[PDB]
């Protein structure tokens, strides 16, 4: 049941990996994976009904 993932290596001395085994039945007991996703800011930065083309007039 071991999960093997890669580290993003900062300062250096191949891919270096690390291992993780969950010891408990409840997912709430798990550590945080930090393997997170990013999304585009559009729902906050461009919430307009008509798609904005930046080279065009915003008002036409």
């Amino acid at each position: 049941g071991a999960q093997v993932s890669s580290q993003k290596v900062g300062a250096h001395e191949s891919t270096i990996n690390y291992t993780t085994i969950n010891y408990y039945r409840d997912s709430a007991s798990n550590a945080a994976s930090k393997q997170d996703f990013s999304q585009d800011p559009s729902k906050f930065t461009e919430p307009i009904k008509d798609v904005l083309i930046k080279t065009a007039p915003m008002l036409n």
């Binding site: 071991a2 999960q3 993932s5 393997q35």
Partner: peptide
């Protein structure tokens, strides 16, 4: 067994 990410 093992999972790889």
């Amino acid at each position: 067994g093992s999972s790889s990410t």
